[PDB]
Design a protein around this ligand. Structure first.
Ligand SMILES: CC(C)(C)n1nc(Nc2cccc(Cl)c2)c2c(N)ncnc21
Ligand SMILES: [Ca+2]
Length: 451
């Protein structure tokens, strides 16, 4: 490949973490067009196919166009990374918008799922399967009332191997089709996933639920679920009929994405009481998923920070007369060497991004390099520490300031943290019971990652 990513685009801001890599807000250096770029590290992510298979799917994906599918513009590849450049959406995740509004009904759910099914139907006609369809992959085009839903990451699971790390697997077991767990699957796995999303939109509870990942997967694999919750009494029988056809265990007997669009419930509710119990259960579910995710990313960032702190200190030690002071030019070289040894960071695309990152640290801090490391490494974790407190405060819906032991079991259950391990961890931080405040919860996570 004779085309460089950094020569055409410049990083502006980090948008978040997606499947297989970080998503950066970028801008074309000539035309000024803003774009979302997913950076996939070749070291941290294995390819399921060859280079020729990936290049041909990317070429197809670039020519495809549907209003409920993300637009892919470009694709780049250097020695250690893949860069998927496409359209940026600012409306956020679909479930984050549902928890904000006070009224939600079957007319809203039908309008949501019709968009999702139009996108899936279109992508299935072009022989492209998602496999990992879940609410996080449903983004809203803009912060508007009539904001369309854009499905992201279509086709990536065919070419990139799924992560085994829980910080990347969180919230996926609820939506995965049984045939995907056993290896023989086709496009019908995306109808199952949509069916699960539809079940959560109308009730606020996953149909296959459990206290941990393996318990959820056991339920999925058995394939049995009920409509025995009181909230289903308020919902129509045609909605229940569609879910039954979408959550049909044998994929050949399961409804297609196309035939799901012609279903009576779609055509009737896109041409009625508000589900108030569903909104309260989606709000609770979203808060729980986001706090467990923030806890895992907080522990990861603390481990990444400890490794990078000690590695950067050794680089500045070898570069030092002995007094412990270094110049701006030396600090940039030592910082650039940290990326050459531990891979390029998603936030810093080129040498200019590193030069400005050192300038931002030196604004706060011949300068003491031990002081520079402390500040520079706290800026790498800033997003993970603040997101944890924000996620703890959002989860604490009644603003009591604490979370019960029952909520800790549910949070640590979704994080796959062993019950006996976290129960032993709270006794060391708080000896004398039943609940923890944010400081104690943060102290528990610090002890769970060797601190
Ligand atoms: C994960 C977040 C929500 C940050 N995200 N993911 C996004 N998905 C994405 C981006 C680039 C390439 C590819 Cl293959 C997917 C995405 C997007 N488009 N706009 C805005 N936020 C996006
Ligand atoms: Ca509380």
């Amino acid at each position: 490949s004779t085309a460089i990513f950094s020569d055409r685009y410049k990083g502006q801001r980090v948008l978040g973490k997606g499947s297989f890599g970080e998503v950066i807000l970028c801008k074309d250096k000539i035309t000024g067009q803003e774009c979302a770029v997913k950076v996939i590290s070749k070291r941290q992510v294995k390819q399921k196919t060859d280079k020729e298979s990936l290049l041909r799917e990317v070429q197809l994906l670039k020519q495809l166009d549907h209003p409920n599918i993300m637009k892919l513009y470009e694709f780049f590849e250097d020695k250690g990374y893949f860069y998927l450049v496409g359209e940026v959406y600012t409306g956020g995740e679909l479930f984050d918008e549902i928890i904000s509004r006070k009224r939600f009904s079957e007319v809203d759910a039908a309008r949501i799922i019709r968009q999702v099914l139009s996108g899936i139907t279109y992508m299935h006609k072009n022989k492209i399967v998602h496999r990992d369809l879940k609410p996080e992959n449903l983004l809203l085009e803009s912060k508007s009332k009539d904001a369309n839903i854009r499905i992201i990451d279509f086709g990536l699971s065919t070419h990139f191997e799924a992560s085994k790390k829980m910080k990347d697997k969180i919230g996926t077991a609820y939506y995965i089709a049984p045939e995907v767990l056993h290896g023989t699957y086709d496009e019908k796995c995306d109808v199952w996933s949509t069916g699960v999303i539809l079940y959560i939109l109308l009730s606020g509870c996953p149909p296959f639920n459990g206290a941990n990942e393996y318990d959820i997967l056991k339920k999925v694999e058995k394939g049995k679920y009920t409509f025995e919750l009181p909230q289903w009494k308020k919902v129509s029988e045609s909605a229940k009929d569609l879910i039954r056809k979408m959550l049909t265990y044998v994929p050949s007997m399961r409804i297609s994405a196309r035939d799901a669009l012609d279903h009576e419930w779609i055509q009737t509710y896109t041409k009625v009481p508000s589900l108030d119990n569903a909104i309260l259960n989606i709000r609770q579910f979203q808060g729980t998923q986001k706090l467990a995710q923030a806890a895992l990313l907080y522990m990861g960032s603390k481990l990444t920070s400890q490794d990078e702190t000690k590695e950067l200190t050794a680089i500045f030690h070898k570069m030092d007369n002995g007094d412990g002071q270094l110049d701006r030019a030396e600090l940039i070289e030592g910082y650039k060497e940290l990326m050459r040894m531990k891979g390029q960071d998603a936030s810093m695309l080129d040498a200019s991004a590193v030069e400005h990152e050192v300038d931002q640290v030196l604004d706060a801090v011949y300068i003491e390099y031990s002081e520079f490391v402390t500040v520079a490494m706290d800026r790498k974790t800033l997003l993970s520490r603040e997101r944890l407190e924000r996620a703890f405060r959002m989860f604490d819906s009644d603003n009591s300031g604490k979370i019960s032991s029952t909520e800790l079991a549910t949070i640590f259950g979704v994080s796959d943290v062993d019950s006996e391990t976290w129960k032993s961890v709270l006794s060391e931080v708080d000896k004398n019971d039943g609940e923890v405040d944010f400081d104690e919860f943060q102290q528990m996570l610090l002890k769970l990652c060797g601190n």
